[PDB]
Amino acid sequence: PALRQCCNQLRQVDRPCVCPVLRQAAQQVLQRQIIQGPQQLRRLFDAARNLPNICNIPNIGACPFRA
């Protein structure tokens, strides 16, 4: 399970580093994968931004980092 493992890892990083590491994870997918267009790029970053909530990380909401 990708999500499960993802949340396990995200819970080990310092809370103030949660969004910065997710921004880097998003950039890695953008760089390493073929991102077809504007729509896919949007979904990629939406997915990354929402992980703190999807993973139920205490006091951290969706990361407002830019695409």
């Binding site: 990708a2 999500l3 993802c6 997710l22 880097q24 994870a25 997918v29 939406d46």
Partner: peptide
């Protein structure tokens, strides 16, 4: 640093797979 933790946790490869699937599907 944050960039360091990213690298030391396999660049959050599991998160990358999840993000990539969401980008391709939905």
């Amino acid at each position: 640093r944050c960039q360091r933790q990213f690298l030391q946790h396999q660049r959050l490869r599991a998160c990358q797979r999840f993000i990539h699937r969401r980008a391709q599907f939905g």
